[PDB]
UniProtKB/Swiss-Prot annotation:
Compartments in which it is found: Secreted
Residues of the whole record sequence present: 83 to 192 of 231
Protein name: Nuclease A
Binding-site list for Ca(2+): D21, D40, T41
Active site: R35, E43, R87
Top-rank taxon, per record: Bacteria
Source species: Staphylococcus aureus
Length: 110
C-alpha cells in the first residue's frame, strides 16, 4: 500500500578504493563493496581506456575522494543492504557531494 522513505546520514568512508579494480566501503564494520570486476568484454576491454575512457584516470580522481576526501556518508535508511547487486550499490556523498556525478558521470575518466 504505502512504503516508508527515510534517509539517515551516517559517516561512511572507504578504507582503500582501487577503482580500477575493486572498492570497499566502511559501514558499521561491514565490508560494503561498490561495483566489482564485471564480465570480461573481448570487444571492449581496451588497454588505453582500461575500463571506460582512460581507466587509472577516473580511479585517481576517486582515489582522493576516498583517501584524502574522507567526507563521504550514507544517505539512505531504506534498511535493505542487498537486493540490487548484492551489496554493490551504496550511496556515496563525499564532501556533501556525490562522486559518481563528479567525473564518473562523464563516462568514467573522460
Amino acid at each position: 500500500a504505502t512504503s516508508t522513505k527515510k534517509l539517515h546520514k551516517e559517516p561512511a568512508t572507504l578504507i582503500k578504493a582501487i577503482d580500477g579494480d575493486t572498492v570497499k566501503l566502511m559501514y558499521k564494520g561491514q565490508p560494503m563493496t561498490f561495483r566489482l570486476l564485471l564480465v570480461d568484454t573481448p570487444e571492449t576491454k581496451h588497454p588505453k581506456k582500461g575500463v571506460e575512457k582512460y581507466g587509472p584516470e577516473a580511479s585517481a580522481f576517486t582515489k582522493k575522494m576516498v583517501e584524502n576526501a574522507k567526507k563521504i556518508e550514507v544517505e539512505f535508511d531504506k534498511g535493505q543492504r542487498t537486493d540490487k547487486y548484492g551489496r554493490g550499490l551504496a550511496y556515496i556523498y563525499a564532501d556533501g557531494k556525490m562522486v559518481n556525478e563528479a567525473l564518473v558521470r562523464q563516462g568514467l575518466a573522460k
